[PDB]
Amino acid sequence: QISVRGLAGVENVTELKKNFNRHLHFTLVKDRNVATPRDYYFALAHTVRDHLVGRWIRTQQHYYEKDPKRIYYLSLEFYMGRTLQNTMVNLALENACDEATYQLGLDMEELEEIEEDAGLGNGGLGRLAACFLDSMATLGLAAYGYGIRYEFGIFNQKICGGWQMEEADDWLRYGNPWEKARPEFTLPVHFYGRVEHTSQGAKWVDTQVVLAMPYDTPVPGYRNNVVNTMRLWSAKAPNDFNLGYIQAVLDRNLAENISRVLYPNDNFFEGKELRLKQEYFVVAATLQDIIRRFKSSTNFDAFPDKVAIQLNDTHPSLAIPELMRVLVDLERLDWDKAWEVTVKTCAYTNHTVLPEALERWPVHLLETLLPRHLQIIYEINQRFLNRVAAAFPGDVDRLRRMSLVEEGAVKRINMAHLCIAGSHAVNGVARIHSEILKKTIFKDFYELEPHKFQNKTNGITPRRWLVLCNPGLAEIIAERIGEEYISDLDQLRKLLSYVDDEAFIRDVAKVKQENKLKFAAYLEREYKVHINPNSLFDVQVKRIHEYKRQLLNCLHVITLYNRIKKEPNKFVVPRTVMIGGKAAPGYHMAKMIIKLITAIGDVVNHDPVVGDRLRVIFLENYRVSLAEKVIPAADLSEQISTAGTEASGTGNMKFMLNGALTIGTMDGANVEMAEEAGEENFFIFGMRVEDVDRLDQRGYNAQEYYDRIPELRQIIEQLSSGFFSPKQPDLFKDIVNMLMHHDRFKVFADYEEYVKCQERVSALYKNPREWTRMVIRNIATSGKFSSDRTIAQYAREIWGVEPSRQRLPA
Amino acid sequence: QISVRGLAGVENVTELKKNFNRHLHFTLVKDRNVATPRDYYFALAHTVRDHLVGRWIRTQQHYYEKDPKRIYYLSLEFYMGRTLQNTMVNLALENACDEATYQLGLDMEELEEIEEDAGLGNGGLGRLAACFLDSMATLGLAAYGYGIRYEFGIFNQKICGGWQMEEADDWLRYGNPWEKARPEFTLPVHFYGRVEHTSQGAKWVDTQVVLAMPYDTPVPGYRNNVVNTMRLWSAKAPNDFNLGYIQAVLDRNLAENISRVLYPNDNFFEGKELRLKQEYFVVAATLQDIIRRFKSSTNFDAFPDKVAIQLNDTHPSLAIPELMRVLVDLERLDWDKAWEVTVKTCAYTNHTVLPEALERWPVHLLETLLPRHLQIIYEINQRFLNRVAAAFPGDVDRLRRMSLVEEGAVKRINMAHLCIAGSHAVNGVARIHSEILKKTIFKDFYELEPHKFQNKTNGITPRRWLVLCNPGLAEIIAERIGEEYISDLDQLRKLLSYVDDEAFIRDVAKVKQENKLKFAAYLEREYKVHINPNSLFDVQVKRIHEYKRQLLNCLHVITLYNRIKKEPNKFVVPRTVMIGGKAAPGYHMAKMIIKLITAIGDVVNHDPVVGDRLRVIFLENYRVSLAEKVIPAADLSEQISTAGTEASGTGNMKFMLNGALTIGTMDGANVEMAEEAGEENFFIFGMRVEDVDRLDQRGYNAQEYYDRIPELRQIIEQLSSGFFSPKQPDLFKDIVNMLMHHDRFKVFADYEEYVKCQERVSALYKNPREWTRMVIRNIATSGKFSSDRTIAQYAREIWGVEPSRQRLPA
Numbered sequence A, B: 001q002i003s004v005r006g007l008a009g010v011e012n013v014t015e016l017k018k019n020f021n022r023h024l025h026f027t028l029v030k031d032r033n034v035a036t037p038r039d040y041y042f043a044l045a046h047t048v049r050d051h052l053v054g055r056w057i058r059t060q061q062h063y064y065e066k067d068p069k070r071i072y073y074l075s076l077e078f079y080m081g082r083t084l085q086n087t088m089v090n091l092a093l094e095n096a097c098d099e100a101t102y103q104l105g106l107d108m109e110e111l112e113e114i115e116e117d118a119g120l121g122n123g124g125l126g127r128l129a130a131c132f133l134d135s136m137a138t139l140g141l142a143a144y145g146y147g148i149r150y151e152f153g154i155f156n157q158k159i160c161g162g163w164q165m166e167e168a169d170d171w172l173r174y175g176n177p178w179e180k181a182r183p184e185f186t187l188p189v190h191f192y193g194r195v196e197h198t199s200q201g202a203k204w205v206d207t208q209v210v211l212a213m214p215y216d217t218p219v220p221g222y223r224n225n226v227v228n229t230m231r232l233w234s235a236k237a238p239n240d241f242n243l244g245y246i247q248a249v250l251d252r253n254l255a256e257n258i259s260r261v262l263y264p265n266d267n268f269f270e271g272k273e274l275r276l277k278q279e280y281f282v283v284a285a286t287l288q289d290i291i292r293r294f295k296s297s298t299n300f301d302a303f304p305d306k307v308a309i310q311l312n313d314t315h316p317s318l319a320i321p322e323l324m325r326v327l328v329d330l331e332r333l334d335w336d337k338a339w340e341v342t343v344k345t346c347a348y349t350n351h352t353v354l355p356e357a358l359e360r361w362p363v364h365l366l367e368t369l370l371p372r373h374l375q376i377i378y379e380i381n382q383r384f385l386n387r388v389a390a391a392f393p394g395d396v397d398r399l400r401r402m403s404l405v406e407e408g409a410v411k412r413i414n415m416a417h418l419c420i421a422g423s424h425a426v427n428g429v430a431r432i433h434s435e436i437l438k439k440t441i442f443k444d445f446y447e448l449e450p451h452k453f454q455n456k457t458n459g460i461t462p463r464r465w466l467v468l469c470n471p472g473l474a475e476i477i478a479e480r481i482g483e484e485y486i487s488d489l490d491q492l493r494k495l496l497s498y499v500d501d502e503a504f505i506r507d508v509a510k511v512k513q514e515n516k517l518k519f520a521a522y523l524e525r526e527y528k529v530h531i532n533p534n535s536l537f538d539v540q541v542k543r544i545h546e547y548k549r550q551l552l553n554c555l556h557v558i559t560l561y562n563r564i565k566k567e568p569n570k571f572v573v574p575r576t577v578m579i580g581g582k583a584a585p586g587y588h589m590a591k592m593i594i595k596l597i598t599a600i601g602d603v604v605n606h607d608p609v610v611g612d613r614l615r616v617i618f619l620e621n622y623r624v625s626l627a628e629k630v631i632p633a634a635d636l637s638e639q640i641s642t643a644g645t646e647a648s649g650t651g652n653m654k655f656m657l658n659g660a661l662t663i664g665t666m667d668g669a670n671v672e673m674a675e676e677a678g679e680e681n682f683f684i685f686g687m688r689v690e691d692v693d694r695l696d697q698r699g700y701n702a703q704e705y706y707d708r709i710p711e712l713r714q715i716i717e718q719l720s721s722g723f724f725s726p727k728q729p730d731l732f733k734d735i736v737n738m739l740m741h742h743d744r745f746k747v748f749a750d751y752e753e754y755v756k757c758q759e760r761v762s763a764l765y766k767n768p769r770e771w772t773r774m775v776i777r778n779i780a781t782s783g784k785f786s787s788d789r790t791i792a793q794y795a796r797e798i799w800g801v802e803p804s805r806q807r808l809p810a
């Protein structure tokens, strides 16, 4: 049907169908009469997975013959989403399978909706990992993603009476056709025990053994026949485990709990034992796999020339003392040499500056669970602190501030400090975030070793985030400039010579109308709710957090509703406001925010006076495959965190790429986005980082805003008096309370300039053709934000490998 | 190579190899250079499983078009063992795959040893189920095996210091290529709650829901293209289960425990909740599957014409009140009609008369767990007892003896009584066992309904138990009489006209020497132990139990050792004594017996005076695939239970079929075996049932035997004084104690006649040619004991279906 989806050759289509019928018969053991759409998805899924394997085997062999430096990306999160379309895309099979399946009298898109998301992450940080792996394959790097194969991913979100209900994400119920279990590479992981000293150094003994079993999942690069591997460990009990007989067997579950469930907090540290075990588990099993692969090529001098370990935040920071452990205790290298190797091997990426999000482990946990690693940590601290003292003599304060060990009621290990000491590079995730690191929380570490600190502004993959979710737009782009930009997104810049082209203007706007028409019909079919598609689609999708300021959005929405009710026969530009995302189960405030958003919808959506000029929809169960739908259909993207709090953001980049305009604050990657499009093509408002600093010095008093702004006073009065919750008038007392006395995020201080900016947004929307020319200016400048650029920067400036766009043979 | 293993056509062999290479590449994602023998087993396993599926699909369809009466075999045990060779055998692919694999430079037998046993049973009762399913397929019955898919089967046995150690049988670790998960037929099962009465009858409410997910495994018939299904349920938690978030998810394990592990007692009832849940689970999920299949053909009159449910002992006896429940509470039939349907549908097979082995559930368990079924049970009891009273008025004793409800300190439900009341046929498992039922424990029930009581003497499958484990003997049999006897074992009788044939005599004896030579080399390779293959192979293999009288065997072995040490230069016929089997983890006495057997070996096997005239080997980890090896290599089969205790036995039949002679008591099926071969061709000794009865009346006093038999006195003195346990002289005080004061099984009373009989055994062994002519007389008469005969009897006399030996089309 469409160009970018590749060739549908007679030979390819006839071969596809015969393999589909082979899988339905031999693999699924069904025939046409009994099969359900789920059997059809699986037959297609196995048929597509057949095209991977040859390439998968040839890529693993290529890397053995050629022996290049290997990248190991340790993450506790890989938010993969669905695999079938992405696989077809990267193999150029999309139009072929479509044809083949239409010929068997099936609808391929309806099959695609049966695939479960692999939701092995919470949001941005897990999804960065997924985009990264795609980019690493497309750029021919010899790279491995390592993590944990959780039995249960991010919970599925239900709304009941406007409240969030969490049910378990049993994503493996029907089988995962993409993974290959590999029990032959099972590896022991140790916990507890104690430390013995001998003539021959330290020995860690009397440990409990948990087995780690790997499952490998293919990661195809974009049309270059590279297929890399993501390896996820699963926890297994040993067979003499505890070995009532019955109870002994039942208690095998205790050990296999380690990989059962993904912890559901975004940007919040919870210091639970189970979590620390999961972190140790992935680090221990992965390092032995790494060392084993290094050995099959005695000499660890070349270890850093052959291995790179990237730590995705502090979650796998125990890699550092674990590598020392293996090197010092098991390979018998002396400390100083081991340390040299570790530092040159490891690098660390920070993803936040929020104090509550930093991992800080109780010493009493590590001591029980990992007593040797505690010994190694102390040893690292001592030697570190002697360097600090040598360079800044007499500065006792700096010494306590830099210690990996925090003192106080309960001793903690600051894990961020650990990573800086033991890594050769440390990077933030957008330019303003990297500066903040150097100016504030890592200032002391920067003065000691200025050379470690870098920046690597995030990116997203244009394969999923354009070609896959938006074939309409990809295609009209391709008609004018060719296919090449799919792996070279800078080329989008050539779109700038089409900004005054009448035919392109109409095509950009038509794709956007089509995506809206389709999403509005998804909203009726799957969720029985009725929206006007001629409105401006104003969407905020992302995890629910106070710093993300969903409440600021709520305040805008109430304001519009109030202005409509004040002058009902005045013309307003109609909007559909959509707000979505999960709240972590224990994050009370977050869950109250969700309740507020639906409460506003219960009032606004049923006012006859409002008409369909204003609708508030809470988008239920937000996740990767819902992002693929809503993001293409958006006109306005809301990126309205308080300046200084959102490390980078990546949703911001998804929308820019897909024809939405951005209302946002000067935060994280928003800053470079505006810089790239020019500030005129962006809706920027509110405090800059320095303005927030000015406000903290004299102090934030919210009462002042309540006092000087009647429109805002009225909203608070409405919240308080039970206007949005008539049956429980004091349901929102917590929110009003926080807003008034304890708002760490200065919601009111930005309210006035936000509403004003919102007016300017409505004004451009009134003029379709200028709206669209500005859209073109955004899309045309979105190239910087490709994860291809990001990974090429990691490769040259951190890992020491040259990327390569050359195809491997078929 | 050999005839019975079928054709190896050029076309079949070339097709086999290409599919082997396809599976290794696409399914296993390996290539020749990296593959290990386990990858090779799997590629062959998938290649063979490919030949099943077409037939599997065609058989399920045939049964839908033709709509015959369906047999449902409910068992808590299916002791399947390995699947690959059996599958090849029944498909006639054996020589072909052998050729194909030899051509790829592999050894097929070495691949076969990598398959794990499916040890989803404890011994005879689970293995009867397996033989039955094979026979049901071969005889074209539309039959389904239903049970539980345990994650952990019978534990693997290790010996450490001569003691049994149990480790968990993680049989699913590497995948099971034979099963197909079918999550689309998942079904809810209810537990707990309470009972509400309405206008509209009883309602069972506030229950906990456990999901039951089926896995289907193909059961191929012998060369007739029938492939039936064994469906095993697996326990799954629902997704709103309990829905800390973390802990809620972790606690999903509680519900999935139901199918985690197989209970490891043979012939012993343990009244644990977990076990009763497993029993309810398989019954509930299976009945709904049955009813659903009946509906896809309102009217339950024809239910018994279309459904048969066979209850393999009392384990699935809740089928009875569950069927009433569904019929009465859910389908709204009146009681009397529901009851008529149930009785005509259900039939019950008893497998023991040992009081400690009968299931007798505490009323306080059923009341909490299954409160409605308790109501139904009481209702069944009342109506039952009114029939008894009507037929035997004034007999108050009979009333208390027959009650399904036993009174006393804790109320119990006698489950055997339940099955008799609600079944139309009740059968024992050999002729003497069925009489004992009628004369003793079910005497009252027989007087009430003489018409229910039948006999169905057990059998074994000649496919596994001859063709598969013994191709040497199958082949020489085939050379003289043809292949036909494989599905018609009566034909073996034609062997009787070859008893004086010199060429057949030498061939029978040569196969036996070959099997011995091969087993002796298995004993060195896999277990570093050194046996003389010219000895008589004297083997007792079966679960360890007091009633099986392994101790009687120990007493014989010590006697021989003592007679050798008394006259060392006297000639004895050399023996290798092999004794094997597992003891249930909590069965103390059993575990002590194992310790005794190895202790005797520690003394006997290292005496230089003994030479290699006597060796005692404990055969470690006895299980289905070890039976396939040792049984063909046996000269003497030990079947020496006290008369009246072994319901039937099936090992007895395996050995008879494979050229061993039998030393045994007149117990269970031994009685019909001797009757079929003639008593002269059998070594029969010891008390008959009536002799044991005579002894119970005057009372068993073991001291008398100790007093009158010096050879026995000496053995007890040796046991007591620490001769077999020098470091712990009183290690065997328990056994000596039991033997002397509390032997429920009258070991000493049989000792004298056992040793005498053992002498007559050694005497025939001295004359090879007469030994062998008697072997021929046994094998030639072993036909009655084919499970083909047994199942044909169930079919005609219980299920009301005509068997059929006609092939289905390819």
Ligand SMILES: O=c1[nH]c(=O)n([C@@H]2O[C@H](CO)[C@@H](O)[C@H](O)[C@H]2O)cc1C(F)(F)F
Binding pocket: A122, A123, A124, A125, A126, A128, A265, A266, A267, A268, A313, A350, A351, A352, A357, A358, A429, A458, A646, A647, A648, A649, A650, A668
């Ligand atoms: O727990 C988290 N969850 C996230 O989504 N991020 C996100 O990580 C993304 C990846 O760089 C950034 O774009 C976002 O600004 C950032 O908030 C970070 C953390 C942590 F606190 F840094 F660990």
Ligand SMILES: O=c1[nH]c(=O)n([C@@H]2O[C@H](CO)[C@@H](O)[C@H](O)[C@H]2O)cc1C(F)(F)F
Binding pocket: B122, B123, B124, B125, B126, B128, B265, B266, B267, B268, B313, B350, B351, B352, B357, B358, B429, B458, B646, B647, B648, B649, B650, B668
């Ligand atoms: O728990 C058991 N385990 C067994 O192996 N059998 C055996 O079941 C076999 C099947 O008929 C018979 O040949 C044996 O004589 C009998 O002991 C019986 C029971 C039970 F007690 F009847 F339930």
